[PDB]
Design a binder for this molecule. Sequence first.
Ligand code: 8UZ
Ligand code: MG
Ligand code: MG
Ligand code: MG
Ligand code: MG
Ligand code: MG
Ligand code: MG
Ligand code: MG
Ligand code: MG
Ligand code: MG
Ligand code: MG
Ligand code: MG
Ligand code: MG
Ligand code: MG
Ligand code: MG
Ligand code: MG
Ligand code: MG
Ligand code: MG
Ligand code: MG
Ligand code: MG
Ligand code: MG
Ligand code: MG
Ligand code: MG
Ligand code: MG
Ligand code: MG
Ligand code: MG
Ligand code: MG
Ligand code: MG
Ligand code: MG
Ligand code: MG
Ligand code: MG
Ligand code: MG
Ligand code: MG
Ligand code: MG
Ligand code: MG
Ligand code: MG
Ligand code: MG
Ligand code: MG
Ligand code: MG
Ligand code: MG
Ligand code: MG
Ligand code: MG
Ligand code: MG
Ligand code: MG
Ligand code: MG
Ligand code: MG
Ligand code: MG
Ligand code: MG
Ligand code: MG
Ligand code: MG
Ligand code: MG
Ligand code: MG
Ligand code: MG
Ligand code: MG
Ligand code: MG
Ligand code: MG
Ligand code: MG
Ligand code: MG
Ligand code: MG
Ligand code: MG
Ligand code: MG
Ligand code: MG
Ligand code: MG
Ligand code: MG
Ligand code: MG
Ligand code: MG
Ligand code: MG
Ligand code: MG
Ligand code: MG
Ligand code: MG
Ligand code: MG
Ligand code: MG
Ligand code: MG
Ligand code: MG
Ligand code: MG
Ligand code: MG
Ligand code: MG
Ligand code: MG
Ligand code: MG
Ligand code: MG
Ligand code: MG
Ligand code: MG
Ligand code: MG
Ligand code: MG
Ligand code: MG
Ligand code: MG
Ligand code: MG
Ligand code: MG
Ligand code: MG
Ligand code: MG
Ligand code: MG
Ligand code: MG
Ligand code: MG
Ligand code: MG
Ligand code: MG
Ligand code: MG
Ligand code: MG
Ligand code: MG
Ligand code: MG
Ligand code: MG
Ligand code: MG
Ligand code: MG
Ligand code: MG
Ligand code: MG
Ligand code: MG
Ligand code: MG
Ligand code: MG
Ligand code: MG
Ligand code: MG
Ligand code: MG
Ligand code: MG
Ligand code: MG
Ligand code: MG
Ligand code: MG
Ligand code: MG
Ligand code: MG
Ligand code: MG
Ligand code: MG
Ligand code: MG
Ligand code: MG
Ligand code: MG
Ligand code: MG
Ligand code: MG
Ligand code: MG
Ligand code: MG
Ligand code: MG
Ligand code: MG
Ligand code: MG
Ligand code: MG
Ligand code: MG
Ligand code: MG
Ligand code: MG
Ligand code: MG
Ligand code: MG
Ligand code: MG
Ligand code: MG
Ligand code: MG
Ligand code: MG
Ligand code: MG
Ligand code: MG
Ligand code: MG
Ligand code: MG
Ligand code: MG
Ligand code: MG
Ligand code: MG
Ligand code: MG
Ligand code: MG
Ligand code: MG
Ligand code: MG
Ligand code: MG
Ligand code: MG
Ligand code: MG
Ligand code: MG
Ligand code: MG
Ligand code: MG
Ligand code: MG
Ligand code: MG
Ligand code: MG
Ligand code: MG
Ligand code: MG
Ligand code: MG
Ligand code: MG
Ligand code: MG
Ligand code: MG
Ligand code: MG
Ligand code: MG
Ligand code: MG
Ligand code: MG
Ligand code: MG
Ligand code: MG
Ligand code: MG
Ligand code: MG
Ligand code: MG
Ligand code: MG
Ligand code: MG
Ligand code: MG
Ligand code: MG
Ligand code: MG
Ligand code: MG
Ligand code: MG
Ligand code: MG
Ligand code: MG
Ligand code: MG
Lengths: 47, 273
Amino acid sequence: MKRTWQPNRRKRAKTHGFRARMRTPGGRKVLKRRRQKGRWRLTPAVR
Amino acid sequence: AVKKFKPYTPSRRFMTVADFSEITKTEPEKSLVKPLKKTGGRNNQGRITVRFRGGGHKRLYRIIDFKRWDKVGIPAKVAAIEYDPNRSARIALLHYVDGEKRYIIAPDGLQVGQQVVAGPDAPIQVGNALPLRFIPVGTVVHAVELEPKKGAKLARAAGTSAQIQGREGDYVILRLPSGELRKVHGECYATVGAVGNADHKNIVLGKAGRSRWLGRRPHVRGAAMNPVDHPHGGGEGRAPRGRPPASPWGWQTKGLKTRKRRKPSSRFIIARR
RNA sequence: GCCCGGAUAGCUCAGUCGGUAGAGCAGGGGAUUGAAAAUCCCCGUGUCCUUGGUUCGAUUCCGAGUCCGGGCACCA
RNA sequence: UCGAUGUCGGCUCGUCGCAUCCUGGGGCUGAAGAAGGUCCCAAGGGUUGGGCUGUUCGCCCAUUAAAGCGGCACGCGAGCU
RNA sequence: CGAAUGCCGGCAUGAGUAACGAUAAAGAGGGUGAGAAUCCCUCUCGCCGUAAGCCCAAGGGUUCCUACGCAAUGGUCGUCAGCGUAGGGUUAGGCGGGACCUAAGGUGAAGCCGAAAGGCGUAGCCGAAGGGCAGCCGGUUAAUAUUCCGGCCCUUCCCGCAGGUGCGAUGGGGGGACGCUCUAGGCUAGGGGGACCGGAGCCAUGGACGAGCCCGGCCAGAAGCGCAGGGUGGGAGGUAGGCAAAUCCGCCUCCCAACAAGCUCUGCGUGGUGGGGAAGCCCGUACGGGUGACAACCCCCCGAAGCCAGGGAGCCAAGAAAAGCCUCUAAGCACAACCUGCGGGAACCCGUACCGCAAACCGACACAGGUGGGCGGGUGCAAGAGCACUCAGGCGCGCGGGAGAACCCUCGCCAAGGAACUCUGCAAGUUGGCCCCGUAACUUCGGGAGAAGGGGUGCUCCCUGGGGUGAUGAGCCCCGGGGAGCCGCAGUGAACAGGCUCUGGCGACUGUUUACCAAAAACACAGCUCUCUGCGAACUCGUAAGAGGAGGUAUAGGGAGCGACGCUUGCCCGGUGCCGGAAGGUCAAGGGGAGGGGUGCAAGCCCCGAACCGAAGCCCCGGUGAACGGCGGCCGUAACUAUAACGGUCCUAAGGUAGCGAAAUUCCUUGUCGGGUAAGUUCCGACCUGCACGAAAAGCGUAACGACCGGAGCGCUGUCUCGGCGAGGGACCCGGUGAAAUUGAACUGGCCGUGAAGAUGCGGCCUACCCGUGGCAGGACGAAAAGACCCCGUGGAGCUUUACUGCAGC
RNA sequence: CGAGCUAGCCCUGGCCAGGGUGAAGCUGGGGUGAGACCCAGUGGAGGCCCGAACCGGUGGGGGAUGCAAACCCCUCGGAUG
RNA sequence: GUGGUUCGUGGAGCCAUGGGGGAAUCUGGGCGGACCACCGCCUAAGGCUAAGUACUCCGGGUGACCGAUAGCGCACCAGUA
RNA sequence: CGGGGGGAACCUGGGGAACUGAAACAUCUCAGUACCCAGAGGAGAGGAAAGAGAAAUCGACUCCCUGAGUAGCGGCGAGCG
RNA sequence: GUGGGAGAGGGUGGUGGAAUUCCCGGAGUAGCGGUGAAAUGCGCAGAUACCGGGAGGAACGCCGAUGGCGAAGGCAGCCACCUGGUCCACCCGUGACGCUGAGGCGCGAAAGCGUGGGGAGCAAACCGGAUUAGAUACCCGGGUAGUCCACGCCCUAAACG
Ligand SMILES: NC[C@H]1O[C@H](O[C@H]2[C@H](O[C@@H]3O[C@H](CO)[C@@H](O)[C@H](N)[C@H]3O)[C@@H](O)[C@H](N)C[C@@H]2N)[C@H](N)[C@@H](O)[C@@H]1O
Ligand SMILES: [Mg+2]
Ligand SMILES: [Mg+2]
Ligand SMILES: [Mg+2]
Ligand SMILES: [Mg+2]
Ligand SMILES: [Mg+2]
Ligand SMILES: [Mg+2]
Ligand SMILES: [Mg+2]
Ligand SMILES: [Mg+2]
Ligand SMILES: [Mg+2]
Ligand SMILES: [Mg+2]
Ligand SMILES: [Mg+2]
Ligand SMILES: [Mg+2]
Ligand SMILES: [Mg+2]
Ligand SMILES: [Mg+2]
Ligand SMILES: [Mg+2]
Ligand SMILES: [Mg+2]
Ligand SMILES: [Mg+2]
Ligand SMILES: [Mg+2]
Ligand SMILES: [Mg+2]
Ligand SMILES: [Mg+2]
Ligand SMILES: [Mg+2]
Ligand SMILES: [Mg+2]
Ligand SMILES: [Mg+2]
Ligand SMILES: [Mg+2]
Ligand SMILES: [Mg+2]
Ligand SMILES: [Mg+2]
Ligand SMILES: [Mg+2]
Ligand SMILES: [Mg+2]
Ligand SMILES: [Mg+2]
Ligand SMILES: [Mg+2]
Ligand SMILES: [Mg+2]
Ligand SMILES: [Mg+2]
Ligand SMILES: [Mg+2]
Ligand SMILES: [Mg+2]
Ligand SMILES: [Mg+2]
Ligand SMILES: [Mg+2]
Ligand SMILES: [Mg+2]
Ligand SMILES: [Mg+2]
Ligand SMILES: [Mg+2]
Ligand SMILES: [Mg+2]
Ligand SMILES: [Mg+2]
Ligand SMILES: [Mg+2]
Ligand SMILES: [Mg+2]
Ligand SMILES: [Mg+2]
Ligand SMILES: [Mg+2]
Ligand SMILES: [Mg+2]
Ligand SMILES: [Mg+2]
Ligand SMILES: [Mg+2]
Ligand SMILES: [Mg+2]
Ligand SMILES: [Mg+2]
Ligand SMILES: [Mg+2]
Ligand SMILES: [Mg+2]
Ligand SMILES: [Mg+2]
Ligand SMILES: [Mg+2]
Ligand SMILES: [Mg+2]
Ligand SMILES: [Mg+2]
Ligand SMILES: [Mg+2]
Ligand SMILES: [Mg+2]
Ligand SMILES: [Mg+2]
Ligand SMILES: [Mg+2]
Ligand SMILES: [Mg+2]
Ligand SMILES: [Mg+2]
Ligand SMILES: [Mg+2]
Ligand SMILES: [Mg+2]
Ligand SMILES: [Mg+2]
Ligand SMILES: [Mg+2]
Ligand SMILES: [Mg+2]
Ligand SMILES: [Mg+2]
Ligand SMILES: [Mg+2]
Ligand SMILES: [Mg+2]
Ligand SMILES: [Mg+2]
Ligand SMILES: [Mg+2]
Ligand SMILES: [Mg+2]
Ligand SMILES: [Mg+2]
Ligand SMILES: [Mg+2]
Ligand SMILES: [Mg+2]
Ligand SMILES: [Mg+2]
Ligand SMILES: [Mg+2]
Ligand SMILES: [Mg+2]
Ligand SMILES: [Mg+2]
Ligand SMILES: [Mg+2]
Ligand SMILES: [Mg+2]
Ligand SMILES: [Mg+2]
Ligand SMILES: [Mg+2]
Ligand SMILES: [Mg+2]
Ligand SMILES: [Mg+2]
Ligand SMILES: [Mg+2]
Ligand SMILES: [Mg+2]
Ligand SMILES: [Mg+2]
Ligand SMILES: [Mg+2]
Ligand SMILES: [Mg+2]
Ligand SMILES: [Mg+2]
Ligand SMILES: [Mg+2]
Ligand SMILES: [Mg+2]
Ligand SMILES: [Mg+2]
Ligand SMILES: [Mg+2]
Ligand SMILES: [Mg+2]
Ligand SMILES: [Mg+2]
Ligand SMILES: [Mg+2]
Ligand SMILES: [Mg+2]
Ligand SMILES: [Mg+2]
Ligand SMILES: [Mg+2]
Ligand SMILES: [Mg+2]
Ligand SMILES: [Mg+2]
Ligand SMILES: [Mg+2]
Ligand SMILES: [Mg+2]
Ligand SMILES: [Mg+2]
Ligand SMILES: [Mg+2]
Ligand SMILES: [Mg+2]
Ligand SMILES: [Mg+2]
Ligand SMILES: [Mg+2]
Ligand SMILES: [Mg+2]
Ligand SMILES: [Mg+2]
Ligand SMILES: [Mg+2]
Ligand SMILES: [Mg+2]
Ligand SMILES: [Mg+2]
Ligand SMILES: [Mg+2]
Ligand SMILES: [Mg+2]
Ligand SMILES: [Mg+2]
Ligand SMILES: [Mg+2]
Ligand SMILES: [Mg+2]
Ligand SMILES: [Mg+2]
Ligand SMILES: [Mg+2]
Ligand SMILES: [Mg+2]
Ligand SMILES: [Mg+2]
Ligand SMILES: [Mg+2]
Ligand SMILES: [Mg+2]
Ligand SMILES: [Mg+2]
Ligand SMILES: [Mg+2]
Ligand SMILES: [Mg+2]
Ligand SMILES: [Mg+2]
Ligand SMILES: [Mg+2]
Ligand SMILES: [Mg+2]
Ligand SMILES: [Mg+2]
Ligand SMILES: [Mg+2]
Ligand SMILES: [Mg+2]
Ligand SMILES: [Mg+2]
Ligand SMILES: [Mg+2]
Ligand SMILES: [Mg+2]
Ligand SMILES: [Mg+2]
Ligand SMILES: [Mg+2]
Ligand SMILES: [Mg+2]
Ligand SMILES: [Mg+2]
Ligand SMILES: [Mg+2]
Ligand SMILES: [Mg+2]
Ligand SMILES: [Mg+2]
Ligand SMILES: [Mg+2]
Ligand SMILES: [Mg+2]
Ligand SMILES: [Mg+2]
Ligand SMILES: [Mg+2]
Ligand SMILES: [Mg+2]
Ligand SMILES: [Mg+2]
Ligand SMILES: [Mg+2]
Ligand SMILES: [Mg+2]
Ligand SMILES: [Mg+2]
Ligand SMILES: [Mg+2]
Ligand SMILES: [Mg+2]
Ligand SMILES: [Mg+2]
Ligand SMILES: [Mg+2]
Ligand SMILES: [Mg+2]
Ligand SMILES: [Mg+2]
Ligand SMILES: [Mg+2]
Ligand SMILES: [Mg+2]
Ligand SMILES: [Mg+2]
Ligand SMILES: [Mg+2]
Ligand SMILES: [Mg+2]
Ligand SMILES: [Mg+2]
Ligand SMILES: [Mg+2]
Ligand SMILES: [Mg+2]
Ligand SMILES: [Mg+2]
Ligand SMILES: [Mg+2]
Ligand SMILES: [Mg+2]
Ligand SMILES: [Mg+2]
Ligand SMILES: [Mg+2]
Ligand SMILES: [Mg+2]
Ligand SMILES: [Mg+2]
Ligand SMILES: [Mg+2]
Ligand SMILES: [Mg+2]
Ligand SMILES: [Mg+2]
Ligand SMILES: [Mg+2]
Ligand SMILES: [Mg+2]
Ligand SMILES: [Mg+2]
């Protein structure tokens, strides 16, 4: 039956992407946290 | 007056459709239509601020002329009577003699072919807009400005009208469609006649879908809900209000008056609904 | 089965700070009427449910008993 | 027994008790005969089909030798419903 | 450290056990190889074929093609592979997207708001599966192709030449530009037939050398032309409107054409040319190549839902925008510029492999699930995308061999009976398509209706009616009518394809719902009523700005109840709510200061403070019932009895009206009576003693409707008496691969007792050689889940209110 | 941090085999003083009917360490709203 | 009206300030816990100002600190699979 | 000419919880903590008396010890200080 | 046919004054109302009585008659429009074209009914005050349908002379 992940590349970038994160103070602190932890990807890969 | 239908389905027994006889022109005046953005009852947050709205037929907005005084003196011909979906009345198309086209809201008896005009001049006759102060006492009128130059406000809806009961100083006394006895400024414009399409209040929608065409989604009673939801939610099988009957937001809904008491306009009202 | 009320004139009922208890209707005797009603004038009257106790004195306060009215008997 | 002993009834499948419903053997009889009453022995076997109700029970129809009463976690849901 | 359903890890038990993932199905020969049911090839067999074939879009991201490989991945095997290693492969001015447009929304100069963060917002900008925009056919590669090649076409930019013209834009105007249902005409796609055209070969097995059988008889194409169709008036005069200007557009008037007449645009046909081109045989191709061939290349018919296209009609619920494009003028320039035609030059960036109803996507899996668009052939069955078979094409589902027990699943049939089964005809069965006949109560006159119940249905010959296309004819195609016969158990001969009736409850209806135990009598629904709301509306969201309401205006909008329709919806305003009430009472801050007090020598500074004035609220007066709500008791009485029209009296704000009633409500209860049955706790009809109906939490009815829930009957049945037999897929055996929960350890019997009260484990007896396999489930208080019931905890959380206290709001 | 599931709305597109029923209207006829109205033919309406796709999820059976953390088979509801 | 302080309205000053009213320039003003007197202290409504102080991404020294289930999550291509 | 963004912890400023404790709980506590925001810097804040507060005293600010769990605050409870 | 007449005959559209009620302003005070008599009710929150302004609906005094007109039901301020029936006169035209009339069709007071409107007065039902043995009556205070308009129904009557 229809499950929860219905991949759509524009949705992914439009929602979790770098320009989104930067757009919002909540989002900019995501980037700050993921940098401080040393995450290799800061943002889902998408494409 | 109200086409009926043989009952060849359920819901076609009681269905009732407008009589469209008066309608002369079956597609609108392209320079006079702009698109309108269906809200679905949502505000500029994304939030429903009016319940049970949405769906419903697409519509183009006919821009209509609720100030007639920026054409003072210029007569116009009534070219067509048209169906505006954004209102219960009908719109009359006006061809002015200087060549401008405008939509007026269509009075009762106004027939295609007629000449119409607006101003302190102008015969007291159906279609003519004037400052109230020049309209003889006792005249029924519609599309009244409430304050001068600010646009027609009162008695725009199909069949409605308003009546001049008197003059006092700079103001005249109208009886509004509601029966309120209001002062209005003498310089306010109004056009003479009732609105027409009076038969409108007698249509019988007849089924659920026909409400849905008009953009009205189903409405659920507080009684139908749970206590999280409504002052009336809950209670085992049915149950009466159990408290003074209320809105979803808790305020009482039989008799509780909501008009702000200190409103400046209170000096100008004489009566009620 | 468990808690609540009530029991006062023939009927329906009020009332009591513990000391002489009343209303309406019924009922009795007179009047009025040709005669019945309606009306008018007189009129009583009950051991205030039983049973113990408190007290000088109990319809009145106390605790039980009857019988009647009420409410309850839920979770499995 | 609450770090679980699934709870009415039906179905399936039995098995036991006897305070015996029937069949077998008895005594007394207010036992003429036939048919009963009552009590005694006896548990080998038997102990119907339907209407109503979830019902157990019970009532009713039509039969019968008879249409017994109980126990088995109100027998039986790692057997079904 | 021995315990914490402890933590981490390792290894056991169950066990060679369940399982190896759709019951579409396999068999042999040959090849290869160390090894072959599993890889390749051939032949046979079977399954899909509105797909299980083919083409797009997402998503995936090398899976593509080739060589060399088989450790692991593959539910077995593997020489194979979507796997390992390596090399190769994706080619565009015209396909898609971007150097175009706007949509919701997003963002956002101006501007507004907010403690900060931020929130809004006009223009503008961004934003597409919409709008605009120039490529078709074939060939080629192991792998790409509208991309490379071949052929024939075309667009934009730049520059130049010629001819034309007041040129000129971000401004004005036109256009773009629109719904739903139905539909005309002419075409095309697509298909069928042909005795005509072309073609290897075929005559078996009794017959046929035949007007035999088998195979094919097209594709694209500028201008021109032809057929069909869309768009569209021409001229003048006035002109104050389209935020300047306009010669444009709009508006008035007069004059011509009414018509595609013309002009224009598009479909299709034809067209210089270019391409393709079967069966069959041969070559070995793993996959194609050769030939067939100088292939033929034509007539008829069916015919779209596609095209002409902005076609036509009707209807109400009234159906985007902007650019491209045309027109007008403005600065400005008119040597510019623009328009047309021809020529040269110039034409960028990203995508392109492969999978794509799935072994490559979403589901931990090579998962019986989910996944949008297009194409989807033939024959037959009334039609069709339905059903059966079948083409192209694709597949036989990555364990097999055997056996032919119980038992299970899916399936077939059954003597007599026919619901006796059971909570219930649950399940199965009957019925079943089309044509004709025929069809009741009741009804809102539509229905009920496919009511019900019947008849027909195949093939053969003869005759015969109308239509389409052709020509008015043959031919092909469609719809039939009548007659005579033939065969079988049977002719919608297989497949797809209602069982029907009566009578109650509930809900009017179609709809909607607890994704994953409830689809309903619940919600919704048209409709009826109350109420609020005069517009900067009430109401909602937001601290605000803002916004929805609504670019709406009382025939409107919000809230609430009721819920089509019919006939109706009584009485009570004491209490609560709401509504009204300029008086009176009370009332906070504030005002006011009679009086008092602190200190100082004093002037003074400071503190308290009565009267009186002083909102809303509340008290008080009154209204209000489709506002929250409520709507009695006792005693007596009639010339048989019984009952009580009648009387009396207590109480209340008023004591339940019509209608209905043992009910989705009735405790007693299987009430009593009647109906139905042989028998009826259910069901239907009555009665009324209504524990505890009753009028918009509506009362009582109602045709029609219902995968709702009762009750009855007919029909028919393996539901049952009462089971039997058969089939296939498991179970069983052999070869391959090989889990799980569970598990203190175990050398793990019965009875009667005992024991923490239900013992393999203790006592006494009894029984009992060791170990397995297939079976059944009585026990191990079997497993699973630290009982969800119940209580406890001064545990939690949702909900309510005239609980307390607060806050928003008013 | 989430509306890539799910619920509503907004913008822009797409889809719905085939058959049946036969509303208004229109036309003709009849009727009348004129009408209402009647009949036929035409017409093609509808939360109309039957049934695929598509959307559902009624009843039963199977599954229950599944093929599946909701599936499969039979049956059944809607199918121009 | 409220925050700060030990000060929770308390006899409640001080410091700050959202609202109202609203001065003076040494004989001016604030303060010493309501207020008044007396006696003292201090000069609001502008600004700046090292050091002594806090911390440890970073380098170094040293452990009656661990020794691969420890020690950082990571001794190893880990904020990775 | 400058600003913008980053930085482990440290700093300041604007805003600011609840569990918890009070063996219930509301004032109180937790706590001006967590956390969000703005800003600083190698530190930051603070700072040169309209101060203390009883001495006729002391002299900017910061930091440690002490004063001292004192003075006080406090449903005069828990506790705070 | 011609020329004349009378009339509340009918359909429509307008329009006037008296009065009742409500509201606003003024003035003014203690009662008003009501009946057999009363009470309910209204009134110092300023009633009644009076004056001024306004709103709204219904019915048309005098004329008015025992009168007129209509087939009946019925029809009454005024104005206009449209329209029926009718009478007289003159004796002009048609030439029996007539009477009645089962069925049919149309009209049809009041009440009632549907869907809208409208609602001052009145007023079934209902409430309240009296009266009474009771009083679901007569009288009093309230009061909703209705009465009024449009459209469509109902089709009754002591629809009677
Ligand atoms: N059929 C034609 C006419 O017949 C009569 O008129 C007559 C008319 O009557 C008049 O009608 C009027 C209508 O009521 C009245 O206003 C006069 N009072 C009255 O005298 C006579 O005065 C003429 N002389 C003869 C005329 N035929 C009818 N009455 C009219 O209605 C009708 O239109
Ligand atoms: Mg997941
Ligand atoms: Mg996308
Ligand atoms: Mg890296
Ligand atoms: Mg927005
Ligand atoms: Mg937003
Ligand atoms: Mg729609
Ligand atoms: Mg309405
Ligand atoms: Mg209607
Ligand atoms: Mg609605
Ligand atoms: Mg509702
Ligand atoms: Mg609910
Ligand atoms: Mg809540
Ligand atoms: Mg909520
Ligand atoms: Mg609530
Ligand atoms: Mg409630
Ligand atoms: Mg209830
Ligand atoms: Mg409820
Ligand atoms: Mg008493
Ligand atoms: Mg005598
Ligand atoms: Mg005594
Ligand atoms: Mg005594
Ligand atoms: Mg319980
Ligand atoms: Mg309970
Ligand atoms: Mg237990
Ligand atoms: Mg257990
Ligand atoms: Mg015997
Ligand atoms: Mg004998
Ligand atoms: Mg004898
Ligand atoms: Mg025996
Ligand atoms: Mg039964
Ligand atoms: Mg029992
Ligand atoms: Mg019983
Ligand atoms: Mg028992
Ligand atoms: Mg049991
Ligand atoms: Mg059992
Ligand atoms: Mg079970
Ligand atoms: Mg059981
Ligand atoms: Mg352990
Ligand atoms: Mg093992
Ligand atoms: Mg085993
Ligand atoms: Mg086995
Ligand atoms: Mg096996
Ligand atoms: Mg398999
Ligand atoms: Mg083989
Ligand atoms: Mg096919
Ligand atoms: Mg993947
Ligand atoms: Mg790879
Ligand atoms: Mg391998
Ligand atoms: Mg393997
Ligand atoms: Mg596998
Ligand atoms: Mg590979
Ligand atoms: Mg460029
Ligand atoms: Mg743009
Ligand atoms: Mg923004
Ligand atoms: Mg696009
Ligand atoms: Mg293109
Ligand atoms: Mg081309
Ligand atoms: Mg090609
Ligand atoms: Mg390929
Ligand atoms: Mg030009
Ligand atoms: Mg064909
Ligand atoms: Mg030939
Ligand atoms: Mg032969
Ligand atoms: Mg030959
Ligand atoms: Mg201009
Ligand atoms: Mg068009
Ligand atoms: Mg068109
Ligand atoms: Mg110039
Ligand atoms: Mg490609
Ligand atoms: Mg594949
Ligand atoms: Mg699929
Ligand atoms: Mg598809
Ligand atoms: Mg597989
Ligand atoms: Mg799959
Ligand atoms: Mg997968
Ligand atoms: Mg068929
Ligand atoms: Mg097709
Ligand atoms: Mg049989
Ligand atoms: Mg039978
Ligand atoms: Mg049944
Ligand atoms: Mg069935
Ligand atoms: Mg019948
Ligand atoms: Mg029927
Ligand atoms: Mg019919
Ligand atoms: Mg039939
Ligand atoms: Mg029927
Ligand atoms: Mg045959
Ligand atoms: Mg068949
Ligand atoms: Mg089928
Ligand atoms: Mg069939
Ligand atoms: Mg059928
Ligand atoms: Mg019943
Ligand atoms: Mg329903
Ligand atoms: Mg339904
Ligand atoms: Mg529901
Ligand atoms: Mg569910
Ligand atoms: Mg759930
Ligand atoms: Mg259903
Ligand atoms: Mg209704
Ligand atoms: Mg607000
Ligand atoms: Mg606002
Ligand atoms: Mg708005
Ligand atoms: Mg708006
Ligand atoms: Mg509403
Ligand atoms: Mg309801
Ligand atoms: Mg009816
Ligand atoms: Mg009341
Ligand atoms: Mg009240
Ligand atoms: Mg009151
Ligand atoms: Mg007050
Ligand atoms: Mg009162
Ligand atoms: Mg008697
Ligand atoms: Mg009752
Ligand atoms: Mg009854
Ligand atoms: Mg009964
Ligand atoms: Mg009841
Ligand atoms: Mg009962
Ligand atoms: Mg009954
Ligand atoms: Mg009522
Ligand atoms: Mg009610
Ligand atoms: Mg009923
Ligand atoms: Mg019914
Ligand atoms: Mg149903
Ligand atoms: Mg039956
Ligand atoms: Mg069987
Ligand atoms: Mg078998
Ligand atoms: Mg034992
Ligand atoms: Mg031992
Ligand atoms: Mg021992
Ligand atoms: Mg065994
Ligand atoms: Mg067992
Ligand atoms: Mg067990
Ligand atoms: Mg526990
Ligand atoms: Mg406690
Ligand atoms: Mg608690
Ligand atoms: Mg969504
Ligand atoms: Mg149709
Ligand atoms: Mg339908
Ligand atoms: Mg399709
Ligand atoms: Mg779906
Ligand atoms: Mg199902
Ligand atoms: Mg379900
Ligand atoms: Mg099942
Ligand atoms: Mg099972
Ligand atoms: Mg799980
Ligand atoms: Mg259907
Ligand atoms: Mg403080
Ligand atoms: Mg305190
Ligand atoms: Mg203080
Ligand atoms: Mg001081
Ligand atoms: Mg201040
Ligand atoms: Mg001074
Ligand atoms: Mg100071
Ligand atoms: Mg000081
Ligand atoms: Mg001092
Ligand atoms: Mg000082
Ligand atoms: Mg420093
Ligand atoms: Mg290690
Ligand atoms: Mg480690
Ligand atoms: Mg080691
Ligand atoms: Mg290790
Ligand atoms: Mg570690
Ligand atoms: Mg690493
Ligand atoms: Mg701070
Ligand atoms: Mg700040
Ligand atoms: Mg907060
Ligand atoms: Mg503590
Ligand atoms: Mg606590
Ligand atoms: Mg505690
Ligand atoms: Mg607590
Ligand atoms: Mg604190
Ligand atoms: Mg430093
Ligand atoms: Mg103290
Ligand atoms: Mg205390
Ligand atoms: Mg503190
Ligand atoms: Mg003559
Ligand atoms: Mg009548
Ligand atoms: Mg009437
Ligand atoms: Mg009256
Ligand atoms: Mg009398
Ligand atoms: Mg009234
Ligand atoms: Mg008369």
